Design a protein around this ligand. Sequence first.
Ligand SMILES: NC[C@@H]1O[C@H](O[C@H]2[C@@H](O)[C@H](O[C@@H]3[C@@H](O)[C@H](N)C[C@H](N)[C@H]3O[C@H]3O[C@H](CO)[C@@H](O)[C@H](O)[C@H]3N)O[C@@H]2CO)[C@H](N)[C@@H](O)[C@@H]1O
Ligand SMILES: [Mg+2]
Ligand SMILES: [Mg+2]
Ligand SMILES: [Mg+2]
Ligand SMILES: [Mg+2]
Ligand SMILES: [Mg+2]
Ligand SMILES: [Mg+2]
Ligand SMILES: [Mg+2]
Ligand SMILES: [Mg+2]
Ligand SMILES: [Mg+2]
Ligand SMILES: [Mg+2]
Ligand SMILES: [Mg+2]
Ligand SMILES: [Mg+2]
Ligand SMILES: [Mg+2]
Ligand SMILES: [Mg+2]
Ligand SMILES: [Mg+2]
Ligand SMILES: [Mg+2]
Ligand SMILES: [Mg+2]
Ligand SMILES: [Mg+2]
Ligand SMILES: [Mg+2]
Ligand SMILES: [Mg+2]
Ligand SMILES: [Mg+2]
Ligand SMILES: [Mg+2]
Ligand SMILES: [Mg+2]
Ligand SMILES: [Mg+2]
Ligand SMILES: [Mg+2]
Ligand SMILES: [Mg+2]
Ligand SMILES: [Mg+2]
Ligand SMILES: [Mg+2]
Ligand SMILES: [Mg+2]
Ligand SMILES: [Mg+2]
Ligand SMILES: [Mg+2]
Ligand SMILES: [Mg+2]
Ligand SMILES: [Mg+2]
Ligand SMILES: [Mg+2]
Ligand SMILES: [Mg+2]
Ligand SMILES: [Mg+2]
Ligand SMILES: [Mg+2]
Ligand SMILES: [Mg+2]
Ligand SMILES: [Mg+2]
Ligand SMILES: [Mg+2]
Ligand SMILES: [Mg+2]
Ligand SMILES: [Mg+2]
Ligand SMILES: [Mg+2]
Ligand SMILES: [Mg+2]
Ligand SMILES: [Mg+2]
Ligand SMILES: [Mg+2]
Ligand SMILES: [Mg+2]
Ligand SMILES: [Mg+2]
Ligand SMILES: [Mg+2]
Ligand SMILES: [Mg+2]
Ligand SMILES: [Mg+2]
Ligand SMILES: [Mg+2]
Ligand SMILES: [Mg+2]
Ligand SMILES: [Mg+2]
Ligand SMILES: [Mg+2]
Ligand SMILES: [Mg+2]
Ligand SMILES: [Mg+2]
Ligand SMILES: [Mg+2]
Ligand SMILES: [Mg+2]
Ligand SMILES: [Mg+2]
Ligand SMILES: [Mg+2]
Ligand SMILES: [Mg+2]
Ligand SMILES: [Mg+2]
Ligand SMILES: [Mg+2]
Ligand SMILES: [Mg+2]
Ligand SMILES: [Mg+2]
Ligand SMILES: [Mg+2]
Ligand SMILES: [Mg+2]
Ligand SMILES: [Mg+2]
Ligand SMILES: [Mg+2]
Ligand SMILES: [Mg+2]
Ligand SMILES: [Mg+2]
Ligand SMILES: [Mg+2]
Ligand SMILES: [Mg+2]
Ligand SMILES: [Mg+2]
Ligand SMILES: [Mg+2]
Ligand SMILES: [Mg+2]
Ligand SMILES: [Mg+2]
Ligand SMILES: [Mg+2]
Ligand SMILES: [Mg+2]
Ligand SMILES: [Mg+2]
Ligand SMILES: [Mg+2]
Ligand SMILES: [Mg+2]
Ligand SMILES: [Mg+2]
Ligand SMILES: [Mg+2]
Ligand SMILES: [Mg+2]
Ligand SMILES: [Mg+2]
Ligand SMILES: [Mg+2]
Ligand SMILES: [Mg+2]
Ligand SMILES: [Mg+2]
Ligand SMILES: [Mg+2]
Ligand SMILES: [Mg+2]
Ligand SMILES: [Mg+2]
Ligand SMILES: [Mg+2]
Ligand SMILES: [Mg+2]
Ligand SMILES: [Mg+2]
Ligand SMILES: [Mg+2]
Ligand SMILES: [Mg+2]
Ligand SMILES: [Mg+2]
Ligand SMILES: [Mg+2]
Ligand SMILES: [Mg+2]
Ligand SMILES: [Mg+2]
Ligand SMILES: [Mg+2]
Ligand SMILES: [Mg+2]
Ligand SMILES: [Mg+2]
Ligand SMILES: [Mg+2]
Ligand SMILES: [Mg+2]
Ligand SMILES: [Mg+2]
Ligand SMILES: [Mg+2]
Ligand SMILES: [Mg+2]
Ligand SMILES: [Mg+2]
Ligand SMILES: [Mg+2]
Ligand SMILES: [Mg+2]
Ligand SMILES: [Mg+2]
Ligand SMILES: [Mg+2]
Ligand SMILES: [Mg+2]
Ligand SMILES: [Mg+2]
Ligand SMILES: [Mg+2]
Ligand SMILES: [Mg+2]
Ligand SMILES: [Mg+2]
Ligand SMILES: [Mg+2]
Ligand SMILES: [Mg+2]
Ligand SMILES: [Mg+2]
Ligand SMILES: [Mg+2]
Ligand SMILES: [Mg+2]
Ligand SMILES: [Mg+2]
Ligand SMILES: [Mg+2]
Ligand SMILES: [Mg+2]
Ligand SMILES: [Mg+2]
Ligand SMILES: [Mg+2]
Ligand SMILES: [Mg+2]
Ligand SMILES: [Mg+2]
Ligand SMILES: [Mg+2]
Ligand SMILES: [Mg+2]
Ligand SMILES: [Mg+2]
Ligand SMILES: [Mg+2]
Ligand SMILES: [Mg+2]
Ligand SMILES: [Mg+2]
Ligand SMILES: [Mg+2]
Ligand SMILES: [Mg+2]
Ligand SMILES: [Mg+2]
Ligand SMILES: [Mg+2]
Ligand SMILES: [Mg+2]
Ligand SMILES: [Mg+2]
Ligand SMILES: [Mg+2]
Ligand SMILES: [Mg+2]
Ligand SMILES: [Mg+2]
Ligand SMILES: [Mg+2]
Ligand SMILES: [Mg+2]
Ligand SMILES: [Mg+2]
Ligand SMILES: [Mg+2]
Ligand SMILES: [Mg+2]
Ligand SMILES: [Mg+2]
Ligand SMILES: [Mg+2]
Ligand SMILES: [Mg+2]
Ligand SMILES: [Mg+2]
Ligand SMILES: [Mg+2]
Ligand SMILES: [Mg+2]
Ligand SMILES: [Mg+2]
Ligand SMILES: [Mg+2]
Ligand SMILES: [Mg+2]
Ligand SMILES: [Mg+2]
Ligand SMILES: [Mg+2]
Ligand SMILES: [Mg+2]
Ligand SMILES: [Mg+2]
Ligand SMILES: [Mg+2]
Ligand SMILES: [Mg+2]
Ligand SMILES: [Mg+2]
Ligand SMILES: [Mg+2]
Ligand SMILES: [Mg+2]
Ligand SMILES: [Mg+2]
Ligand SMILES: [Mg+2]
Ligand SMILES: [Mg+2]
Ligand SMILES: [Mg+2]
Ligand SMILES: [Mg+2]
Ligand SMILES: [Mg+2]
Ligand SMILES: [Mg+2]
Ligand SMILES: [Mg+2]
Ligand SMILES: [Mg+2]
Ligand SMILES: [Mg+2]
Ligand SMILES: [Mg+2]
Ligand SMILES: [Mg+2]
Lengths: 273, 47
Amino acid sequence: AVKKFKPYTPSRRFMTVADFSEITKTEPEKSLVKPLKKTGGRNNQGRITVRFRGGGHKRLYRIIDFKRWDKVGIPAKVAAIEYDPNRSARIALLHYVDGEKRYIIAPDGLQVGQQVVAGPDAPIQVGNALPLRFIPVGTVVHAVELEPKKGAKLARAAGTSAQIQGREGDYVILRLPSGELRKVHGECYATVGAVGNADHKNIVLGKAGRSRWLGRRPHVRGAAMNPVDHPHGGGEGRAPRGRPPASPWGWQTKGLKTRKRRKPSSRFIIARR
Amino acid sequence: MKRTWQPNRRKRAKTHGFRARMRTPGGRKVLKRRRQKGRWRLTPAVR
RNA sequence: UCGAUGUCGGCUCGUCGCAUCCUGGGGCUGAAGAAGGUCCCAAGGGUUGGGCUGUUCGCCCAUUAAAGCGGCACGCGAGCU
RNA sequence: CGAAUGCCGGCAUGAGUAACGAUAAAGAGGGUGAGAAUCCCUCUCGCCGUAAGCCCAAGGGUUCCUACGCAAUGGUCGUCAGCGUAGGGUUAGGCGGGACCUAAGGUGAAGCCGAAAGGCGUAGCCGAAGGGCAGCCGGUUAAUAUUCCGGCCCUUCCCGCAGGUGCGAUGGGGGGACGCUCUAGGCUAGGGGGACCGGAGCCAUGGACGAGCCCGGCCAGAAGCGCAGGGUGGGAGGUAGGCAAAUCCGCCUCCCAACAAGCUCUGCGUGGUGGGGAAGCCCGUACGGGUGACAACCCCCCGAAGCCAGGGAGCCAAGAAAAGCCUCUAAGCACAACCUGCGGGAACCCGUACCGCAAACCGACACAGGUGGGCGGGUGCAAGAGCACUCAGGCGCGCGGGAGAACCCUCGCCAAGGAACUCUGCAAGUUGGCCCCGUAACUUCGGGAGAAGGGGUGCUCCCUGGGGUGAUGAGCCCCGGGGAGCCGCAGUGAACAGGCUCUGGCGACUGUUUACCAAAAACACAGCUCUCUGCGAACUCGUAAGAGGAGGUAUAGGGAGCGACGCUUGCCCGGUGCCGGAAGGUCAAGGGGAGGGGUGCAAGCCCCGAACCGAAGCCCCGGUGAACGGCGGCCGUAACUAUAACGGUCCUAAGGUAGCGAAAUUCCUUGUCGGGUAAGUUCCGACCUGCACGAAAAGCGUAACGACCGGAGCGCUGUCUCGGCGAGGGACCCGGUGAAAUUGAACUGGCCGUGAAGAUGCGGCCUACCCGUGGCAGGACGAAAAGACCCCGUGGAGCUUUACUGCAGC
RNA sequence: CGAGCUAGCCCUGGCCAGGGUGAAGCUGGGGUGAGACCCAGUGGAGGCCCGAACCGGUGGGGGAUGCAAACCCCUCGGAUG
RNA sequence: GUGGUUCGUGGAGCCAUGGGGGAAUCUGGGCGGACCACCGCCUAAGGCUAAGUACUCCGGGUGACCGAUAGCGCACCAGUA
RNA sequence: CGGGGGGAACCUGGGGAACUGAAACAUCUCAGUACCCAGAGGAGAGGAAAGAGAAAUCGACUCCCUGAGUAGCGGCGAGCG
RNA sequence: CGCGGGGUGGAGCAGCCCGGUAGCUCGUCGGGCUCAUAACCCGAAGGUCGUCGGUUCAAAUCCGGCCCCCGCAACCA
RNA sequence: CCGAGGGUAGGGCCCGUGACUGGGGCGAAGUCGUAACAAGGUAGCUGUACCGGAAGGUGCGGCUGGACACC
RNA sequence: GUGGGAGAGGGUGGUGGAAUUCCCGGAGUAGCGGUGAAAUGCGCAGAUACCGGGAGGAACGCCGAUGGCGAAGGCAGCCA
Ligand SMILES: NC[C@@H]1O[C@H](O[C@H]2[C@@H](O)[C@H](O[C@@H]3[C@@H](O)[C@H](N)C[C@H](N)[C@H]3O[C@H]3O[C@H](CO)[C@@H](O)[C@H](O)[C@H]3N)O[C@@H]2CO)[C@H](N)[C@@H](O)[C@@H]1O
Ligand SMILES: [Mg+2]
Ligand SMILES: [Mg+2]
Ligand SMILES: [Mg+2]
Ligand SMILES: [Mg+2]
Ligand SMILES: [Mg+2]
Ligand SMILES: [Mg+2]
Ligand SMILES: [Mg+2]
Ligand SMILES: [Mg+2]
Ligand SMILES: [Mg+2]
Ligand SMILES: [Mg+2]
Ligand SMILES: [Mg+2]
Ligand SMILES: [Mg+2]
Ligand SMILES: [Mg+2]
Ligand SMILES: [Mg+2]
Ligand SMILES: [Mg+2]
Ligand SMILES: [Mg+2]
Ligand SMILES: [Mg+2]
Ligand SMILES: [Mg+2]
Ligand SMILES: [Mg+2]
Ligand SMILES: [Mg+2]
Ligand SMILES: [Mg+2]
Ligand SMILES: [Mg+2]
Ligand SMILES: [Mg+2]
Ligand SMILES: [Mg+2]
Ligand SMILES: [Mg+2]
Ligand SMILES: [Mg+2]
Ligand SMILES: [Mg+2]
Ligand SMILES: [Mg+2]
Ligand SMILES: [Mg+2]
Ligand SMILES: [Mg+2]
Ligand SMILES: [Mg+2]
Ligand SMILES: [Mg+2]
Ligand SMILES: [Mg+2]
Ligand SMILES: [Mg+2]
Ligand SMILES: [Mg+2]
Ligand SMILES: [Mg+2]
Ligand SMILES: [Mg+2]
Ligand SMILES: [Mg+2]
Ligand SMILES: [Mg+2]
Ligand SMILES: [Mg+2]
Ligand SMILES: [Mg+2]
Ligand SMILES: [Mg+2]
Ligand SMILES: [Mg+2]
Ligand SMILES: [Mg+2]
Ligand SMILES: [Mg+2]
Ligand SMILES: [Mg+2]
Ligand SMILES: [Mg+2]
Ligand SMILES: [Mg+2]
Ligand SMILES: [Mg+2]
Ligand SMILES: [Mg+2]
Ligand SMILES: [Mg+2]
Ligand SMILES: [Mg+2]
Ligand SMILES: [Mg+2]
Ligand SMILES: [Mg+2]
Ligand SMILES: [Mg+2]
Ligand SMILES: [Mg+2]
Ligand SMILES: [Mg+2]
Ligand SMILES: [Mg+2]
Ligand SMILES: [Mg+2]
Ligand SMILES: [Mg+2]
Ligand SMILES: [Mg+2]
Ligand SMILES: [Mg+2]
Ligand SMILES: [Mg+2]
Ligand SMILES: [Mg+2]
Ligand SMILES: [Mg+2]
Ligand SMILES: [Mg+2]
Ligand SMILES: [Mg+2]
Ligand SMILES: [Mg+2]
Ligand SMILES: [Mg+2]
Ligand SMILES: [Mg+2]
Ligand SMILES: [Mg+2]
Ligand SMILES: [Mg+2]
Ligand SMILES: [Mg+2]
Ligand SMILES: [Mg+2]
Ligand SMILES: [Mg+2]
Ligand SMILES: [Mg+2]
Ligand SMILES: [Mg+2]
Ligand SMILES: [Mg+2]
Ligand SMILES: [Mg+2]
Ligand SMILES: [Mg+2]
Ligand SMILES: [Mg+2]
Ligand SMILES: [Mg+2]
Ligand SMILES: [Mg+2]
Ligand SMILES: [Mg+2]
Ligand SMILES: [Mg+2]
Ligand SMILES: [Mg+2]
Ligand SMILES: [Mg+2]
Ligand SMILES: [Mg+2]
Ligand SMILES: [Mg+2]
Ligand SMILES: [Mg+2]
Ligand SMILES: [Mg+2]
Ligand SMILES: [Mg+2]
Ligand SMILES: [Mg+2]
Ligand SMILES: [Mg+2]
Ligand SMILES: [Mg+2]
Ligand SMILES: [Mg+2]
Ligand SMILES: [Mg+2]
Ligand SMILES: [Mg+2]
Ligand SMILES: [Mg+2]
Ligand SMILES: [Mg+2]
Ligand SMILES: [Mg+2]
Ligand SMILES: [Mg+2]
Ligand SMILES: [Mg+2]
Ligand SMILES: [Mg+2]
Ligand SMILES: [Mg+2]
Ligand SMILES: [Mg+2]
Ligand SMILES: [Mg+2]
Ligand SMILES: [Mg+2]
Ligand SMILES: [Mg+2]
Ligand SMILES: [Mg+2]
Ligand SMILES: [Mg+2]
Ligand SMILES: [Mg+2]
Ligand SMILES: [Mg+2]
Ligand SMILES: [Mg+2]
Ligand SMILES: [Mg+2]
Ligand SMILES: [Mg+2]
Ligand SMILES: [Mg+2]
Ligand SMILES: [Mg+2]
Ligand SMILES: [Mg+2]
Ligand SMILES: [Mg+2]
Ligand SMILES: [Mg+2]
Ligand SMILES: [Mg+2]
Ligand SMILES: [Mg+2]
Ligand SMILES: [Mg+2]
Ligand SMILES: [Mg+2]
Ligand SMILES: [Mg+2]
Ligand SMILES: [Mg+2]
Ligand SMILES: [Mg+2]
Ligand SMILES: [Mg+2]
Ligand SMILES: [Mg+2]
Ligand SMILES: [Mg+2]
Ligand SMILES: [Mg+2]
Ligand SMILES: [Mg+2]
Ligand SMILES: [Mg+2]
Ligand SMILES: [Mg+2]
Ligand SMILES: [Mg+2]
Ligand SMILES: [Mg+2]
Ligand SMILES: [Mg+2]
Ligand SMILES: [Mg+2]
Ligand SMILES: [Mg+2]
Ligand SMILES: [Mg+2]
Ligand SMILES: [Mg+2]
Ligand SMILES: [Mg+2]
Ligand SMILES: [Mg+2]
Ligand SMILES: [Mg+2]
Ligand SMILES: [Mg+2]
Ligand SMILES: [Mg+2]
Ligand SMILES: [Mg+2]
Ligand SMILES: [Mg+2]
Ligand SMILES: [Mg+2]
Ligand SMILES: [Mg+2]
Ligand SMILES: [Mg+2]
Ligand SMILES: [Mg+2]
Ligand SMILES: [Mg+2]
Ligand SMILES: [Mg+2]
Ligand SMILES: [Mg+2]
Ligand SMILES: [Mg+2]
Ligand SMILES: [Mg+2]
Ligand SMILES: [Mg+2]
Ligand SMILES: [Mg+2]
Ligand SMILES: [Mg+2]
Ligand SMILES: [Mg+2]
Ligand SMILES: [Mg+2]
Ligand SMILES: [Mg+2]
Ligand SMILES: [Mg+2]
Ligand SMILES: [Mg+2]
Ligand SMILES: [Mg+2]
Ligand SMILES: [Mg+2]
Ligand SMILES: [Mg+2]
Ligand SMILES: [Mg+2]
Ligand SMILES: [Mg+2]
Ligand SMILES: [Mg+2]
Ligand SMILES: [Mg+2]
Ligand SMILES: [Mg+2]
Ligand SMILES: [Mg+2]
Ligand SMILES: [Mg+2]
Ligand SMILES: [Mg+2]
Ligand SMILES: [Mg+2]
Ligand SMILES: [Mg+2]
Ligand SMILES: [Mg+2]
Ligand SMILES: [Mg+2]
Ligand SMILES: [Mg+2]
């Protein structure tokens, strides 16, 4: 957990780096599994549609298995634990006995020697995937399918997890990382345990640049613009907002609920406190 | 100091070039106008 | 005078007025002497260096015969700042 | 046509005036020629030399070479030229690019969307300064050369012979295939020295015939070999995966290696031949050509950032694709095919001159500006691409000759004094490199720190330690140490090279910004908090399709404020915004048809049309402060006086807590006191009557940081008392070239008046021969710009909102 | 019709003399019940320091019908991000 | 719900049609300015159709059209420098 | 077998402004104009009544004259027709 | 000067704005409870509404003048 | 050479003094309330934490040096 | 040393039921709460009281003593 640094510079002071002892590889990754990708924050018309993005280190994209159900019953050994620079979490390289090599997002608790499976069969132990209906109430669980066969959308980020609070008919009730209480279909695959690399939240960037390396550009406050530019700005000598605080496009940024009311999804949600 | 003309022979024909004009309706009427007027050169020099 | 008469203060350079700050000449005095008070004549000349402030001004330090008030587009930016 | 700051052209004034475009710098002889400071040669002088030399890419497009020219172009001249006329000149299977690959992007069968034009989109395709791929050294022309030629190597295609083999691809696998910082061992470019090798020639002016002085001592090169490195397991058995099949690949198991041991690839070395080859003298050259010679062609050292190259180590931000390439099987074919080696053949299109930090490119100019890559020698100074001189090479900047005023610019020095200058030490000075001693508050324990403040610095001789390379030796090279002397005003002797301290404000910090008047206390920033978003996410761009978000998933993503860190961030929910509320109230279309009307003989057809049911929204109830925001008044009171812990009452949704406080906020104000100073509207501490601080438009501190803004001291000064002298480029005189704004016309004086109120022009009076040159700026309400301030116009435009009315969005 | 200037991002290359400080880590030693830790050498971190190239544009002077429609001189900021 | 028409919601018919409902074939259906009756007119939901009309790159004829600052931008090697 | 692209102006179709007028300005106007797009051609469009509209009338369409600045339309305004 | 609000028993506030009526809390005075004071309970007193002029039958009330008060404003210059 | 000492520079310690500021001692009869001693009228005390004109109040835990009716 | 003992002695992981609160459903009506007495609050938008489900956190009643253990602070459901 968390390398620190004596302050031989300002900003080497509170700067903080992850603990990579867990990483069993480096300079990988399995060349069979990874293409590349690009963007700018700009979109197919050339237009910035997400602000303050660009720069940052070149990445290769590790292809990664979110359908574990196509291997039902085939076992696999955990081969390696290494670094993915497209996600908060770390990926486990695993060899199947098919001789197929695949990437899994690494649960907290995997040592690399261990066997993992997926399917209704599936001993209930860290690393194994099952359909939710066969997992006993109370299990902490990650990488969940939202609908059956569509891939795992939930609890994928470092340290996240979910809990089975009970079942109703064809569906099971899940407490998400948000605390929202959600029904999910019994046939959705999930793997048991929590994501791990959970100390991720305690890295401390420590200098401006380390934000740029992650591709995050400087973010300027409405407050500091002119009135063409943003609902708050001018007059200056600073100013309070002069108005209920707003986004550049004019909507209100405190309190104002953006989820749409009539989504058929609403029929499956009970929460989010 | 750096002025506004920084000639690049490729850039000139991919921007104002004859094929370039011919691709955009905006651009075809640029040609029609120049032909209708009798320009000697409908489209720039580049070597 | 708006088909433009650049505006405070400083600096440089001055010039003029006298309702005189000093020096010269006077009357009166509640002028013994010395030293002052006040009023008259007189524009020849002279009228310091410095702390503060953009400052003019003003206060202040140290001197002085004295540390004069004004005009010249609040003299002077085709002379400077 | 007389006026429009009219329009077009022509010609004036200014005026022979300013300038002639870097202060690197010129002088003479000879030549050519009608004509020469300017063209050609020689000699002397000066300037560049991590360039002002040389190569490459862009871009330019004949500017290249030579002959004959000088009207113009050339900031003068021109006999010269980048100029005129003409002729000539660019040679590639190997260099660059294409009959190869893929990247962003582009384009796009399929497909999707859009009134039309069109928008999108998987495969494919196109796309390069990336990947792939075979040429090195010399000679030759006036002008091209890895292109022609000489010598020595090499690649593909085609066909044939031999030998080999399950052959075969657009398909499967391997590889290609990668970051940043540090970096080992061995090489090479490159460089330095030699008493050793080769060479014309030299003894000057006191000395020197010398182990003298000056010149040179390499280049390329298949196989073979050697040194150094990269890459790399071998065998079987199973095998369900690698969208078919694989013997390949993956995966499991057993067996031997464990090491480059081998196999293999590249670097360098050497190598058959090949080829260069100075100073000097001589001719004879916009250029170089004989000889030197039959040249020599060797040792030692220094040593890459280049090579071996996928080398190694560490770190986190985690570091392209595809083809060539090899392997695998598929159809298919096995006469084929493929592999290997030898041989003959065949091997296309375009670029190729020249300029290329510039007089040939971008800047209207032969323009002090701008322009990517590579090479960039020697010596000295700690190093170095820094600095001074200098190789090769290239230049003296396309007006000159004088003179030696004011004034200006760039620079040098100054008696005594030393910030007295001034808004302000602005400016300039001081300081200055390296080694050694030494070094405070405070501090986040790193810093502060080059703190401060000092000492050393050259040359000669004596002794002497360690290293590199060689042997462990000399030599050569690097790092020192001690000892005794010498000279000068002075030894980082010239050049490049911090002035320092105390103390405030603001901002944590490095960063960022108004291209071209603002670099900052503004923006950003790690970090804290609120808020939205369950994923076909929210949000954003788009009519849409689609895309970004994100091939992400709440430890994530969007929005907002605050802005490291420390200690903290009070009270109010009445209004407003957001959030929750299944009732109640009102509510549009629609449902409803009480009742009424028009017209018909009537059946009807046709209008209105009450109750009632009926969304969101508003009303209503409530919650919400790191949401918009807001956080009182008058009166009294203590055994001196003052003051008021205390009380009274009026109002509020609530009445400002902590901490700060004449402040980047304090009007009165230069508040009062204290400090500093001889003297302090500034500045520092303090008091609190805070006009009008106050807690994330954050409050109060904070080490470190700052081309920020304020205050003081030391050091030192031409800032100043207060100027002086000197240098150079101008200014002035002469020869050549020769502008510009401006200009109603001029025969253009002072004063006191007058006049539209500031008269050369009118009145009176004074003064005044005609014309210039160098100078100064008081005046022509001097020039420039149809005043930007101010108002006007029912002029215009950016911006705001509970202005009006719309629209997107929801 | 324009991103051949300028602003951002995407793709692919390249550049950054020389010096100065000396983080973690590792090794050894001390310490301890075992540690923390302390010291030494090694090591070579960093929007670290000095300073060329390259990037800037602080202060001042000159220029102002300019060499230049933003320049020149002197000084000065960054210079592995 | 809109457009067209002189018709701007007007008593608003007619022609057209984005949306909902949705017939009949002579006794069928549209129209004559809301609607009703009467009396008339006409036969939608398929198509083609000369000429009389517009215009002038081009050829010709004619000007109380210009005559090189005019007449086209161009009398000339001009959409050129 | 055909299509594609071009053509001065003219024609039809899909779409469609603003200045300006209203002596400000929203309806209105400019205006179905400018423009953009698609398709015709030597012309294009339109054309043989589910028409006019008051006469027991007229007979497809186009163009000119007239009706007529009439009927109307209109912040019953400017104006439109 | 400019605009807005204000002046009422001793203190602090209503009432004015709509003419006839002056009220609330404290305080003061008398009495009670208590050993005594406060607290608490029962009673009471107290004003011409800043001032001057007008309007009306009648003025705290409506109007004007002045006098004080509090508040905002004083910009381009 | 060393050398009294003079000079320049930077530290350390101690005393004095300073606008102002913090509490404290002490001083017959000033103001405000009643915290404590009798369940002192809320048992008291206590470390600590927040708050409040003031004594003090409240939270968490603690000590006894506190505790004849009624459920 | 050997052999035996009692114990809430400490660390770790697990786990059980009672209760409180919150929600969902059921039924049900006019108050509930609270105090010295009240009021604030809660409730006809259906509260309290009653039944069923669920979420979650905390502390462990009886055994329990005037008891045991620990150096002190302290240590109490149950299992390893
Ligand atoms: N020295 C005792 C300490 O001081 C305090 O005591 C101080 C005050 O509280 C106390 O003041 C008292 C006051 O409480 C009491 N109720 C009224 C009394 N008259 C005052 O007394 C004071 O007043 C006068 C001056 O006029 C002096 O003469 C008298 O000595 C003095 N005590 O007098 C002391 C100072 O003189 C506290 N008791 C406490 O902090 C501690 O016990
Ligand atoms: Mg595009
Ligand atoms: Mg960010
Ligand atoms: Mg942030
Ligand atoms: Mg920001
Ligand atoms: Mg701003
Ligand atoms: Mg904009
Ligand atoms: Mg806005
Ligand atoms: Mg604002
Ligand atoms: Mg402000
Ligand atoms: Mg405000
Ligand atoms: Mg130009
Ligand atoms: Mg190019
Ligand atoms: Mg380009
Ligand atoms: Mg032609
Ligand atoms: Mg004027
Ligand atoms: Mg004029
Ligand atoms: Mg006199
Ligand atoms: Mg006298
Ligand atoms: Mg006398
Ligand atoms: Mg005089
Ligand atoms: Mg005088
Ligand atoms: Mg001053
Ligand atoms: Mg004054
Ligand atoms: Mg005046
Ligand atoms: Mg003046
Ligand atoms: Mg001036
Ligand atoms: Mg002046
Ligand atoms: Mg003047
Ligand atoms: Mg006239
Ligand atoms: Mg002249
Ligand atoms: Mg002259
Ligand atoms: Mg001259
Ligand atoms: Mg001759
Ligand atoms: Mg001759
Ligand atoms: Mg001759
Ligand atoms: Mg050199
Ligand atoms: Mg070229
Ligand atoms: Mg000439
Ligand atoms: Mg060849
Ligand atoms: Mg090629
Ligand atoms: Mg090609
Ligand atoms: Mg071919
Ligand atoms: Mg190609
Ligand atoms: Mg290609
Ligand atoms: Mg298609
Ligand atoms: Mg496209
Ligand atoms: Mg391709
Ligand atoms: Mg290429
Ligand atoms: Mg290449
Ligand atoms: Mg090639
Ligand atoms: Mg050659
Ligand atoms: Mg094979
Ligand atoms: Mg591959
Ligand atoms: Mg060599
Ligand atoms: Mg050397
Ligand atoms: Mg001699
Ligand atoms: Mg010589
Ligand atoms: Mg050599
Ligand atoms: Mg060789
Ligand atoms: Mg010979
Ligand atoms: Mg490597
Ligand atoms: Mg391909
Ligand atoms: Mg060539
Ligand atoms: Mg240059
Ligand atoms: Mg270059
Ligand atoms: Mg040249
Ligand atoms: Mg040029
Ligand atoms: Mg020149
Ligand atoms: Mg130039
Ligand atoms: Mg230059
Ligand atoms: Mg350059
Ligand atoms: Mg070099
Ligand atoms: Mg040096
Ligand atoms: Mg140099
Ligand atoms: Mg010159
Ligand atoms: Mg001097
Ligand atoms: Mg001195
Ligand atoms: Mg002074
Ligand atoms: Mg200075
Ligand atoms: Mg310091
Ligand atoms: Mg020093
Ligand atoms: Mg310091
Ligand atoms: Mg010496
Ligand atoms: Mg010497
Ligand atoms: Mg060596
Ligand atoms: Mg010098
Ligand atoms: Mg120096
Ligand atoms: Mg320095
Ligand atoms: Mg300091
Ligand atoms: Mg200050
Ligand atoms: Mg800063
Ligand atoms: Mg920096
Ligand atoms: Mg820095
Ligand atoms: Mg900024
Ligand atoms: Mg600027
Ligand atoms: Mg600037
Ligand atoms: Mg700066
Ligand atoms: Mg949209
Ligand atoms: Mg999407
Ligand atoms: Mg997407
Ligand atoms: Mg994606
Ligand atoms: Mg965010
Ligand atoms: Mg801010
Ligand atoms: Mg707050
Ligand atoms: Mg408070
Ligand atoms: Mg509120
Ligand atoms: Mg509320
Ligand atoms: Mg309702
Ligand atoms: Mg109805
Ligand atoms: Mg009837
Ligand atoms: Mg409603
Ligand atoms: Mg409310
Ligand atoms: Mg104060
Ligand atoms: Mg203030
Ligand atoms: Mg102060
Ligand atoms: Mg503030
Ligand atoms: Mg705030
Ligand atoms: Mg702040
Ligand atoms: Mg502060
Ligand atoms: Mg500070
Ligand atoms: Mg900075
Ligand atoms: Mg700064
Ligand atoms: Mg001087
Ligand atoms: Mg001179
Ligand atoms: Mg003129
Ligand atoms: Mg005359
Ligand atoms: Mg006059
Ligand atoms: Mg003058
Ligand atoms: Mg002059
Ligand atoms: Mg003048
Ligand atoms: Mg003027
Ligand atoms: Mg004007
Ligand atoms: Mg302006
Ligand atoms: Mg108006
Ligand atoms: Mg207007
Ligand atoms: Mg660009
Ligand atoms: Mg660019
Ligand atoms: Mg170093
Ligand atoms: Mg370093
Ligand atoms: Mg740095
Ligand atoms: Mg640095
Ligand atoms: Mg720095
Ligand atoms: Mg630096
Ligand atoms: Mg500058
Ligand atoms: Mg970078
Ligand atoms: Mg209409
Ligand atoms: Mg209409
Ligand atoms: Mg109608
Ligand atoms: Mg009808
Ligand atoms: Mg019918
Ligand atoms: Mg009909
Ligand atoms: Mg009809
Ligand atoms: Mg009718
Ligand atoms: Mg009809
Ligand atoms: Mg037709
Ligand atoms: Mg004709
Ligand atoms: Mg004629
Ligand atoms: Mg003409
Ligand atoms: Mg003529
Ligand atoms: Mg013409
Ligand atoms: Mg056509
Ligand atoms: Mg149409
Ligand atoms: Mg109008
Ligand atoms: Mg008008
Ligand atoms: Mg208007
Ligand atoms: Mg119209
Ligand atoms: Mg149309
Ligand atoms: Mg026709
Ligand atoms: Mg037709
Ligand atoms: Mg037709
Ligand atoms: Mg119309
Ligand atoms: Mg009365
Ligand atoms: Mg204003
Ligand atoms: Mg001594
Ligand atoms: Mg001493
Ligand atoms: Mg108590
Ligand atoms: Mg008590
Ligand atoms: Mg008590
Ligand atoms: Mg008590
Ligand atoms: Mg007690
Ligand atoms: Mg309390
Ligand atoms: Mg015991």
